[PDB]
Design an enzyme around this catalytic site. Sequence first.
Site, short mmCIF file in Angstrom:
data_model
loop_
_atom_site.label_atom_id
_atom_site.label_comp_id
_atom_site.label_asym_id
_atom_site.label_seq_id
_atom_site.Cartn_x
_atom_site.Cartn_y
_atom_site.Cartn_z
N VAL A 1 1.31 -1.40 0.01
CA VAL A 1 0.51 0.07 -0.10
C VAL A 1 1.16 1.50 0.03
O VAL A 1 2.17 1.18 0.28
CB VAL A 1 -0.74 0.03 1.16
CG1 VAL A 1 -2.23 -0.15 0.91
CG2 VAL A 1 -0.68 -1.15 2.37
N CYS A 2 0.38 2.18 -0.94
CA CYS A 2 1.05 3.24 -0.50
C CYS A 2 2.47 3.58 -1.58
O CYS A 2 3.10 4.27 -0.68
CB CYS A 2 1.49 4.16 0.83
SG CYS A 2 -0.28 4.44 1.91
N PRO A 3 2.84 3.14 -2.55
CA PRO A 3 4.17 3.54 -3.44
C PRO A 3 2.86 4.38 -3.77
O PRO A 3 3.21 5.52 -4.41
CB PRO A 3 3.70 2.49 -4.44
CG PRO A 3 3.26 1.82 -3.73
CD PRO A 3 2.15 1.97 -2.87
N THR A 4 1.21 4.54 -3.49
CA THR A 4 0.76 6.19 -4.11
C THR A 4 0.60 7.03 -3.83
O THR A 4 0.43 7.80 -4.84
CB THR A 4 -0.52 5.25 -4.55
OG1 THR A 4 -1.38 5.13 -2.45
CG2 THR A 4 -0.75 3.47 -4.43
#
Length: 167
Positions: A47-50
Amino acid sequence: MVLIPNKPAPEFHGCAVIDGDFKEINLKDYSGKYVVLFFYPADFTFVCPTEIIAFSDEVDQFKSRNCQVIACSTDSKYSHLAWTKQDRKSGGLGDMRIPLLADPTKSIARAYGVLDEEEGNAFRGLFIIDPKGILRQITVNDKPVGRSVDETLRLLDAFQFVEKYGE
């Protein structure tokens, strides 16, 4: 440490990957520009390379405000480079339009007081620095919750407004 606005931001140098190359950057290299320094934990995350992609995609909005955005984590210069080469589809980072400054000695993170000593990586800290290198804004989130591009732009606008005027 005792980070406080209206004081000179802690200076930092380091190797950062930029457009697929290792270049050395220094806070002084951005004298005359606003700098948004934001830290993140781990890397190739599920989660959260975004979040990092979010800022990279709106990089146009930051160039517009005469602002250099710099991402930073406690990983090695090589780990960062690997994340760029990994495409977005795989949990990677795809194309990066903002510098990934590597902080393997953890010293930059501890300098901006965002280091989780128990776990050995940084909190989600965000810092806005003046064209004269003066700290203007401090944001630190608990690890699960991320940052808004719009909020950062709003703040940049407020500061640059006051810089020209003040009312």
